[PDB]
């Protein structure tokens, strides 16, 4: 399948070269997979989600996304126009309030929730969790991310936005999950992207168009935007049978475009997520 005039990040993850605008992907499109977006919520009523999104848990007085961040990330995973995996099922877990903030205890609870709740959902092709959040190092937060991964969920986490080594941030620094840095449309590391040996992969993160609250759309930047590209890619590849939740991060690294990014610090992987799709 081909989507013309796609957001640059979708085109990039289906290309061996920057500078193209069509997204190419197998029409299975992540059908039969599920992606949990652990964030500020998801505006599931957005036309872009086509009934495939639903809120399943909140830790606040409402499950509504009053911020937009979670809706944007969910759109990059799985919205019809802006998403990698256009037929996946999206599940929202609101661990961040409408200011984008959340206590580590709440974030940990949300991760343990997903590890259990996937047993209440029909996801025959596999389960992914996208975590576009983090803060300073916490062994408890890292342990929760490791538990979620060990339970059979492909965990993709944002590296962070401080132009610093991600070893000092959580859950970015947990080795067993998939830690995602950000790139721009000219194949440069995004100016704010964290780096380091803990990174597994880069995805598009600068100027990413996706869904927003109020039935709208906008372009924003962050490792938060790169992470759902990788989460959606994992769901897509799992539906194709090419990998599993336990192996998808390694598979994405194995099949990535290699050596194409600039301003990658020595010791950080030079790997850009790529779907290897051939019509
Ligand atoms: C909107 C732009 C359209 C053109 C794109 N071409 C490239 O990236 C290729 N390139 C890089 C340096 N010199 C040539 C990039 C985005
Ligand atoms: C409202 C949004 C919620 C998530 C926000 N923060 C991060 O991702 C920060 N981070 C990642 C790793 N270490 C720190 C970005 C804004």
CA of 25 to the centre of ligand 1 (A): 22
Structure tokens at 186: 């000219």
Task: Assess if residue 87 is contained within a domain.
Answer: yes
- CB-based contacts of 278, cutoff 8 Å, min separation 6: none
14 CA to centre of own chain: 16
Q: Is 18 in the pocket of ligand 1 (CB under 6 A)?
A: yes
Spatial contact of 134 and 107, defined as CB atoms under 8 Å apart: no
Which residue blocks in the chain are alpha helix, DSSP H?
Answer: 8-13, 69-78, 104-117, 139-150, 223-239, 248-255
Task: Assess if residue 278 is contained within a domain.
Answer: no
Task: Assess if residue 227 is contained within a domain.
Answer: yes
Spatial contact of 96 and 66, defined as CB atoms under 8 Å apart: no
CA distance 251 to 119: 25
Query: Among 5, 12, 2, 8, which Cα is nearest to 261's?
Result: 12
CA distance 199 to 270: 10
Spatial contact of 121 and 142, defined as CB atoms under 8 Å apart: no
CA of 17 to the centre of ligand 1 (A): 9
CATH code where residue 196 lies: 3.40.50.200
Task: Assess if residue 123 is contained within a domain.
Answer: yes
Structure tokens at 83: 């998403």
Query: Among 181, 179, 137, 184, which Cα is nearest to 163's?
Result: 181
Neighbours of 253 (CB within 10 A): 16
CA atoms within 13 A on the CB side of 230: 41
Q: Which of 186, 187, 208 to mutate to test the pocket of ligand 1 (most atoms within 8 A of CB)?
A: 186
CA distance 109 to 114: 9
Task: Assess if residue 149 is contained within a domain.
Answer: yes
CA distance 174 to 189: 21
3-class SS of residue 111: helix
Task: Assess if residue 279 is contained within a domain.
Answer: no
User: The tokens 């030079």 sit on which residue?
Assistant: 270
Domain extent at residue 173: 2-272
Task: Assess if residue 261 is contained within a domain.
Answer: yes
- For atom 16 of ligand 1, the residue with the nearest CA is 19
- For atom 2 of ligand 2, the residue with the nearest CA is 100
Q: Are strands 2-3 and 23-24 parallel, antiparallel or unpaired?
A: antiparallel
User: The tokens 């019809």 sit on which residue?
Assistant: 80
Task: Assess if residue 277 is contained within a domain.
Answer: no
- The total domain count for the chain is 1
Residue 177 phi/psi, 5-degree rounding, is: -100, 180
CA distance 97 to 94: 7
Structure tokens at 197: 């040996």
- Solving technique: X-ray
Query: Among 166, 167, 190, 185, which Cα is nearest to 263's?
Result: 190
- CB-based contacts of 21, cutoff 8 Å, min separation 6: 4, 5, 6, 8, 11
């Amino acid at each position: 399948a081909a989507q013309t005039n796609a957001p640059w990040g979708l085109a990039r993850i289906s290309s061996t070269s920057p500078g193209t605008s069509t997204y190419y992907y197998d029409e299975s499109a992540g059908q039969g997979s599920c992606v949990y977006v652990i964030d500020t919520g998801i505006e599931a009523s957005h036309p872009e989600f086509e009934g495939r999104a639903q809120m399943v848990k909140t830790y606040y007085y409402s499950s509504r996304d009053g911020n937009g961040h979670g809706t944007h990330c969910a759109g990059t995973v799985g919205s019809r126009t802006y998403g990698v995996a256009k037929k996946t099922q999206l599940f929202g877990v609101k661990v961040l309030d409408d200011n984008g903030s959340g206590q580590y205890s709440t974030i940990i609870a949300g991760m343990d929730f997903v590890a259990s709740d996937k047993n209440n959902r029909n996801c025959p092709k596999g389960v992914v969790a996208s975590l576009s959040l983090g803060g300073g190092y916490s062994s408890s937060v890292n342990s929760a991310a490791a538990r979620l991964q060990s339970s059979g969920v492909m965990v993709a986490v944002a590296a962070g936005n401080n132009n610093a080594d991600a070893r000092n941030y959580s859950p970015a620094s947990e080795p067993s999950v998939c830690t995602v840095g950000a790139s721009d449309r000219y194949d440069r590391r995004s100016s704010f992207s964290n780096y380091g040996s803990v990174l597994d992969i880069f995805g598009p993160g600068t100027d990413i168009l996706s869904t927003w609250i109020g039935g709208s759309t906008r372009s924003i930047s962050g490792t938060s935007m790169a992470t759902p590209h990788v989460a959606g890619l994992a769901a897509y590849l799992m539906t194709l049978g090419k990998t599993t939740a336990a192996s998808a991060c390694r598979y994405i690294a194995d099949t990535a475009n290699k050596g194409d990014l600039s301003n990658i610090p020595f010791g950080t992987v030079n790997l850009l997520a790529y779907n290897n799709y051939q019509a």
